[PDB]
Design a protein around this ligand. Structure first.
Ligand code: HEC
Ligand code: HEC
Ligand code: HEC
Ligand SMILES: [Ca+2]
Ligand SMILES: [Ca+2]
Ligand SMILES: [Ca+2]
Ligand SMILES: [Ca+2]
Ligand SMILES: [Ca+2]
Ligand SMILES: [Ca+2]
Ligand SMILES: [Ca+2]
Ligand SMILES: [Ca+2]
Ligand SMILES: [Ca+2]
Ligand SMILES: [Ca+2]
Ligand SMILES: [Ca+2]
Ligand SMILES: [Ca+2]
Ligand SMILES: [Cl-]
Ligand SMILES: [Cl-]
Ligand SMILES: [Cl-]
Ligand SMILES: [Cl-]
Ligand SMILES: [Cl-]
Ligand code: NI
Ligand code: NI
Ligand code: NI
Ligand code: NI
Lengths: 106, 106, 106
């Protein structure tokens, strides 16, 4: 998928998680987020398209999705132990990782 | 190890997992797969050797091993909870990630 | 943070883990290690600054931090199951991954 579609998937599933009623719904949404994070890692964002493909900025962009995938994995750990409310709160905390990348490159 | 040896390790351990008799055998095989996936990420495949080192294709190649490592990690989660048959079925499902990369670059 | 500060964070938390008295202290230290490993992945080490940004050596450097992050994650798994002594021993085993990168690039 392209970068914009992966971002919608990320945004839509944050809300799905917030409103989820059970562990399986949070787990499923978090799995879609991880898939979208890894897929976004393949793109060149518009504001970096003039940079070289392995410029420090493009490396920082790609590693941002590794950081997001690891944070998603911690939240998924909580959902798999059945700690649904703690997983929902960890998911909402993802926004600081979202924001950090946005402030630099979006 | 070189790319071809990492692929054999991946292929051989898929079969080891299929025939495994207990959780520890699946766990051990999945750990060897993850190690091989990360090691393969360092290579340039023959059909991409004319591309630039951070070309979209080489990025897509390397991220494919992140996707495989994450899918392996989900299967390993199942083996560590003792759900041996579910882990064996998740391992067989890895083939769709194997195939997707192969269809593009092998 | 810069590469040198991320390495200190890695070194300091290995010792924190060795002397830890409970699971939460090991968990917290391992989380700081993962964060530092991913952050170090954004740097160019001095001995590679003449290489091209996606040279095989820079790829090998960056993938070394993926390998370290995955090994840290296995240790964290043990700390979250309450197997504190096994997690402490896994952490000390990280040194062979530290050493392998150092022998090549530091
Ligand atoms: C960098 C490593 C990023 C991370 C982590 C996240 N996002 Fe992102 N996002 C990024 C860029 C460079 C862009 C611009 C894309 C473009 O083509 O202009 C975006 C965009 C979005 C959007 C807007 C999508 C649209 O309709 O055009 C949304 C809604 C969005 N991003 C959400 C989002 C969330 C919820 C994240 C964390 C879970 C997140 N992003 C991470 C770069 C990066
Ligand atoms: C890209 C991201 C890949 C993923 C994921 C997997 N493989 Fe692969 N494989 C890839 C390439 C580019 C090649 C060609 C290597 C070459 O030098 O020609 C291969 C090759 C194989 C082989 C053949 C090895 C040989 O004897 O020459 C096998 C048996 C193989 N791959 C298996 C395999 C499995 C089981 C995977 C998932 C678990 C898998 N590969 C993933 C690229 C990629
Ligand atoms: C490559 C993939 C590395 C891994 C994994 C680890 N380290 Fe490292 N380290 C690396 C380099 C290239 C350098 C040189 C940095 C420089 O600017 O010269 C280092 C350095 C250190 C240091 C010295 C820091 C200082 O005071 O200058 C320490 C104490 C250190 N590294 C520790 C360390 C530990 C404990 C690791 C595993 C947990 C580890 N490093 C991994 C490259 C890489
Ligand atoms: Ca839009
Ligand atoms: Ca649009
Ligand atoms: Ca609800
Ligand atoms: Ca609700
Ligand atoms: Ca062959
Ligand atoms: Ca051959
Ligand atoms: Ca058998
Ligand atoms: Ca059998
Ligand atoms: Ca120093
Ligand atoms: Ca110094
Ligand atoms: Ca102590
Ligand atoms: Ca002690
Ligand atoms: Cl996950
Ligand atoms: Cl790269
Ligand atoms: Cl990467
Ligand atoms: Cl794993
Ligand atoms: Cl971890
Ligand atoms: Ni895509
Ligand atoms: Ni190798
Ligand atoms: Ni895990
Ligand atoms: Ni930094």
């Amino acid at each position: 998928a392209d970068l914009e579609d992966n971002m919608e998937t990320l945004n839509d599933n944050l809300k799905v998680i917030e409103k989820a009623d059970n562990a399986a719904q949070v787990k499923d949404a978090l799995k879609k987020m991880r898939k979208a994070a890894l897929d976004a890692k393949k793109a060149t964002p518009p504001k970096l398209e003039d940079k070289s493909p392995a410029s420090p900025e493009m490396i920082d962009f790609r590693v941002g999705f590794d950081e997001l995938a690891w944070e998603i994995h911690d939240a998924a750990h909580l959902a798999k132990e059945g700690k649904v409310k703690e997983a929902q709160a960890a998911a909402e905390q993802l926004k600081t990782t979202c924001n950090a990348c946005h402030q630099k490159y979006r």
